[PDB]
Amino acid sequence: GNFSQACYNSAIQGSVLTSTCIRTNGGYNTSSIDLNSVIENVDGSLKWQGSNFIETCRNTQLAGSSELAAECKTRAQQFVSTKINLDDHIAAIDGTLKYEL
Ligand SMILES: OC[C@H]1O[C@H](O[C@H]2[C@@H](O)[C@H](O)[C@@H](CO)O[C@@H]2O)[C@@H](O)[C@@H](O)[C@@H]1O
User: Fold this and answer.
1) Which of 40, 60, 89, 97 has a CA 20 to 30 Å removed from the CA of 25?
2) How far is residue 65's CA from residue 7's CA, in Å, rounded to a whole number?
3) Residue 45: CB within 6 Å of ligand 1?
């Protein structure tokens, strides 16, 4: 992971992370990744190893350089605040954001 060390000007809109990442040729590239493919809302908490959090969460934000923050519904249908460190699994490879397992 650790995209945040390779990238800057990052933003979250909905479930999409955008960022500008360094390229090996000396330049940079702007890219994006849909975090909804790789993050699950598990009883109100954002977790890896699943998908589709955006269906039952609201008010997504980037906190600091790498934290996804949101408000997500529990199984009992009430909202809690939750966060996950995108640096756990989101990497930058030659200027492009990629998920790494
Ligand atoms: O319904 C879509 C939802 O399914 C799964 O989440 C379950 C649970 O973890 C949630 O707390 C409640 C919230 O209503 O929904 C399900 O019971 C996950 O795959 C989740 O990412 C997805 O949004």
Assistant:
1) 89
2) 9
3) no
Q: Distance between CA atoms of 82 and 3, rounded to whole angstroms?
A: 21
Mention the CATH class of domain 1-101.
mainly beta
Give resolution, Å, one decimal.
1.4
DSSP secondary structure string, 26-92?
A: S-EEEEEEEGGGTEEEETTEEEES---GGGSEEEEEEETTTEEEEEEE-TTS-EEEEEEEGGGTEEE
CB 39 within 8 A of CB 50: yes
Domain ranges for the chain: 1-101
56 lines ligand 1 (CB under 6 A): yes
Residue among 34, 35, 55 to mutate when testing ligand 1 (max atoms within 8 A of CB): 55
